[PDB]
Amino acid sequence: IVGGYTCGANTVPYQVSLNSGYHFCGGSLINSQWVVSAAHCYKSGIQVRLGEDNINVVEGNEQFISASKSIVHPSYNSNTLNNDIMLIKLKSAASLNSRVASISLPTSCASAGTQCLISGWGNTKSSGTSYPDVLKCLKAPILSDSSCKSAYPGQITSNMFCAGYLEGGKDSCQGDSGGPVVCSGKLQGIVSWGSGCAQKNKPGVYTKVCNYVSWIKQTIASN
């Protein structure tokens, strides 16, 4: 996250870190046994880390649980990033409490101007590399489809939305992928892609979760 602030330990209880010997993507806990993340974060050997703040030090409240299976959307296209969403089933149920809780799925899509919270352990510099130890937060509004399509002509499908600031300086970045975009207490987006980070006229692009609620529920129900 570029241009954000320190969230505060466990203030984003649904935030998870996907780890394979190092942090590589974020994700959101949607119930005691399932995490939602981005399809491009897929890999074997994923350990899900819940209740994290400083990802480099064990401080208490952490729960490390192995992924039992990862389900990438059948129509995910790596070339266009359309349908960039993945479900991860945990090997055992997480213990839910004040420091580890799930986030609700949306019943309706959000509209332009809606304020949301994006969080993650990604790069904090628009130019260069600097990974934080603690979870960073950023409040950002959802942009209109017309502004989104103007920024990325021919690259925005109906399953994506832009969020952020056209003036630059505030954005999600490498390492934030798969993480949550929460608005009004509902998970509306998943950190997916963008051109650089915090660049002027190049807002972040996110997977539009409200288009997948049915798929998520049916998939979870049969697994």
């Binding site: 993507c25 981005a38 960039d84 990604g122 999600s172 934030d176 892609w193 963008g194 051109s195 980070c197």
Partner: peptide, 10 residues
């Protein structure tokens, strides 16, 4: 444009 994972996919 790149995905925001580690490492990024462009």
């Amino acid at each position: 444009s790149c995905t925001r994972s580690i490492p990024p996919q462009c």
